[PDB]
Amino acid sequence: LKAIGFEQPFKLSDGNLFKTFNLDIPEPKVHEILVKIQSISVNPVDTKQRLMDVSPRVLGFDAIGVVESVGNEVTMFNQGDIVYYSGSPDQNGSNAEYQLINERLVAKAPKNISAEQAVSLPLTGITAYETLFDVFGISRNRNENEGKTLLIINGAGGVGSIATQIAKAYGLRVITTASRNETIEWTKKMGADIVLNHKESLLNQFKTQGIELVDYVFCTFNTDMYYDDMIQLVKPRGHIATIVAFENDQDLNALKPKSLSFSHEFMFARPLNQTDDMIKHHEYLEDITNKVEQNIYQPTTTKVIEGLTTENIYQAHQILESNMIGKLVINL
Amino acid sequence: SLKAIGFEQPFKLSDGNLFKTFNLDIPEPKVHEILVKIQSISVNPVDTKQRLMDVSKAPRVLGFDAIGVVESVGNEVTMFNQGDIVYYSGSPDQNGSNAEYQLINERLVAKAPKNISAEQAVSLPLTGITAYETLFDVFGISRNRNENEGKTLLIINGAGGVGSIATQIAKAYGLRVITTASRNETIEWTKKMGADIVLNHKESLLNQFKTQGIELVDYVFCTFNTDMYYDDMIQLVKPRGHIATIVAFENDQDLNALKPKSLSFSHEFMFARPLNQTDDMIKHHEYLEDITNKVEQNIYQPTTTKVIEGLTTENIYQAHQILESNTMIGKLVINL
Ligand SMILES: [Mg+2]
Ligand SMILES: [Mg+2]
Ligand SMILES: [Mg+2]
Answer yes or no: do B327 and B250 share one domain. Answer: no
Query: Is residue A257 within 8 angstroms of chain B, CB to CB?
Result: yes
d(C-alpha B112, C-alpha B263), whole Å: 38
Query: Is residue A282 within 8 angstroms of chain B, CB to CB?
Result: no
Number of compact structural domains in chain A: 2
Contact A263 B262 (CB under 8 A): yes
Answer yes or no: do B332 and B198 share one domain. Answer: no
- Which of A134, A135, A245 lies at the smallest CB-CB distance from B256? A245
Which amino acid is present at B63?
A: G
Q: What is the CATH number of the domain that holds A197?
A: 3.40.50.720
Which amino acid is present at B132?
A: Y
Which amino acid is present at A222?
A: N
The torsion angles phi and psi of A310, rounded to 5 degrees, stand at -60, -30
d(C-alpha B246, C-alpha B265), whole Å: 11
Q: Which residues does chain A break after (C to N > 2.5 Å)? A: 55, 323
B155 touches B176 (CB < 8 A):
no
d(C-alpha A136, C-alpha A167), whole Å: 11
- Which of B240, B256, B264 lies at the smallest CB-CB distance from A261? B264
d(C-alpha B108, C-alpha B24), whole Å: 24
3-state DSSP assignment of residue A309: coil
3-state DSSP assignment of residue A158: helix
DSSP B92: T
For CA atoms A232, A233, A238, A243, the dihedral sign is negative
Query: Is residue A116 within 8 angstroms of chain B, CB to CB?
Result: no
Answer yes or no: do B88 and B50 share one domain. Answer: yes
Answer yes or no: do B120 and B134 share one domain. Answer: no
Answer yes or no: do A161 and A214 share one domain. Answer: yes
Q: How far, in Å, is the centroid of ligand 3 from the Cα of B242? A: 30
Q: Which residues of B touch A259 (CB under 8 A)?
A: 133, 137-138, 266-270, 272-273
| Cα angle: A64, vertex A69, A75; to 5 degrees | 90
DSSP B251: S
Residue A277 CA to its chain's centroid (Å):
19
A50-61 b/e with 16+ CB inside 10 Å = b? beeeeebbbbbb
d(C-alpha B141, C-alpha B144), whole Å: 8
Q: Which residues of B touch A265 (CB under 8 A)?
A: 262
Which amino acid is present at B73?
A: V
A217 touches A238 (CB < 8 A):
yes
Method of determination is X-ray
Which helix or strand (DSSP H or E) is residue B265 part of?
A: strand B264-267
3-state DSSP assignment of residue A17: coil
B6 touches B313 (CB < 8 A):
no
**From edge to edge, which strands make up the β-sheet containing B237-245?**
A194-196, A173-177, A149-153, A214-219, A234-242, A261-264, B264-267, B237-245, B217-222, B152-156, B176-180, B197-199
Alpha-carbon distance B254 to nearest alpha carbon in chain A (angstroms):
5
A214 touches A234 (CB < 8 A):
yes
Domain boundary among A220, A243, A270: A270
Expressed as residue numbers, the domain containing B164 is 127-273
Domain boundary among A235, A254, A270: A270
A211 touches A192 (CB < 8 A):
no
Answer yes or no: do B145 and B239 share one domain. Answer: yes
Final resolution, Å: 1.6
Answer yes or no: do B4 and B102 share one domain. Answer: yes
DSSP A109-146: PPSSS-HHHHTTSHHHHHHHHIIIIIIS---SSGGGGT
Strand boundaries in chain A, DSSP class E: 2-5, 19-22, 32-42, 63-70, 82-85, 98-102, 106-108, 149-153, 173-177, 194-196, 214-219, 234-242, 261-264, 301-306, 327-331
